[PDB]
Amino acid sequence: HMFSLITWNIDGLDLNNLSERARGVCSYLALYSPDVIFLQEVIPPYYSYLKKRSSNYEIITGHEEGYFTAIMLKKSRVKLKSQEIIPFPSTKMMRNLLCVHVNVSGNELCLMTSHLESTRGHAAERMNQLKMVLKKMQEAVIFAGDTNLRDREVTRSGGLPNNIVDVWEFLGKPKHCQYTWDTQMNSNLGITAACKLRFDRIFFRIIPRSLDLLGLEKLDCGRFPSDHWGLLCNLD
Ligand SMILES: N#Cc1ccc2cc3c(=O)[nH]c(=O)nc-3n(-c3cccc(-c4nnn[nH]4)c3)c2c1
Numbered sequence: 016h017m018f019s020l021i022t023w024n025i026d027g028l029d030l031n032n033l034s035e036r037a038r039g040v041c042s043y044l045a046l047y048s049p050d051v052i053f054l055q056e057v058i059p060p061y062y063s064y065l066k067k068r069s070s071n072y073e074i075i076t077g078h079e080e081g082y083f084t085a086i087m088l089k090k091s092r093v094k095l096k097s098q099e100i101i102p103f104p105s106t107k108m109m110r111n112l113l114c115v116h117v118n119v120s121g122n123e124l125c126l127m128t129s130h131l132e133s134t135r136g137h138a139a140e141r142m143n144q145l146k147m148v149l150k151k152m153q154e155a156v157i158f159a160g161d162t163n164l165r166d167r168e169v170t171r172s173g174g175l176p177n178n179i180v181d182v183w184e185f186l187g188k189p190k191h192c193q194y195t196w197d198t199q200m201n202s203n204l205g206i207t208a209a210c211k212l213r214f215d216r217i218f219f220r221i222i223p224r225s226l227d228l229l230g231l232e233k234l235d236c237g238r239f240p241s242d243h244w245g246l247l248c249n250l251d
Contacts, residue, residue, distance in 0.1 A: 016120050018250035019049040022159040022215045023229065024130070024243035027058040027082055029203070032236045037061060039240040041068045043229055047247065050119065052087035053128035055161045077113040077128075084113045084128045084160065094118045101151060103144050108132055112148060116155075124221060127152065128160040142172040149179055149218070156220035161243065165212050175218075182217040182226055182248050192228050195244045200231075203242045215246045224249040 025040055027033070041064070044052065052072065054065075062085065066074065072087035075098050088095060097116035114127045129148060132141035141163060152158055153176065169175060183192065194211035198204055217226075229245025 016251065018119065018221065019247065020051040020053065020157065020159060021049045021229065021245055021247050022053045022217060023245035024055040024161040024215060024241060025057065025061065026241040026243065027056045027061040032238050035234055035236050036238065036240045037064045039234045043245065044069060050089045050092050051126055053159045054085040055128065055130040056082045057085045058082055075113065075115055077111050081109050084130050086113060086115050086126060086128055088117060092119060103147065105140060105143065112151065122221065124157055125155045127158040130161045131163050133163055138168060142168055145172050149176060152179055152218065152220065158218035161214050162216045163214050164216065178220065180219050182219055182223045185223065186226055189226060192226050195246060201239055201242055203239050215243055217246065217248055221250050224251060
């Protein structure tokens with residue numbers, strides 16, 4: 016029938032004006048009203064707002080302390096079958112892989128999210144994190160989350176497998192959503208340098224329809240909802 020999802024690193028560690036940014040993030044989720052949501056970098060206070068505002072979603076957290084990922088499932092349409100938190104081994108940043116087995120319209124496709132290593136120097140540790148993601152996908156599939164991948168690190172990690180495709184590259188490599196982390200346009204960072212990267216990615220095992228950016232409008236306090244852009248992929 017139809018399907019949608021939203022990946023967004025809400026940047027929950029950035030405590031400044033977070034009460035207003037979280038009211039903007041919710042306002043984006045309310046108008047679009049997706050079926051599945053993949054959030055990264057969520058602090059316990061941030062999880063408290065989404066629990067009270069978005070009352071029609073069954074949230075599954077990846078941890079409890081620090082920051083963690085989160086999956087929100089449209090309770091009216093998506094049914095919970097299973098849920099599991101597979102942690103990364105040699106992770107030095109309190110990071111894990113969050114998978115949830117659901118059933119939408121009678122179809123068996125699981126949902127995954129993660130927040131791979133943020134460190135740029137810890138590239139091999141991130142690439143080893145990438146390999147365990149693709150190895151778990153083939154073992155169950157729609158992955159989505161802050162990957163922090165760049166500079167052909169997917170190539171040097173052995174490349175993507177045949178059964179796993181990237182929704183961006185699969186849609187003819189569209190240009191409007193080429194970069195989810197844009198230090199040029201997004202000025203929540205004050206970075207005088209200009210770099211653009213595609214961090215938030217979406218891997219597929221249903222056919223993806225569209226892909227678009229979220230949170231491009233500055234709020235009333237002059238700051239964006241997040242340093243990352245929100246991703247939105249429709250399907251059928
Ligand atoms: N401020 C700033 C600032 C300006 C410019 C760049 C440019 C790049 C680039 O062309 N490729 C790349 O892969 N990463 C870049 N980072 C980056 C982004 C996140 C993290 C770390 C990082 N973490 N640890 N060391 N470096 C670097 C930048 C950061």
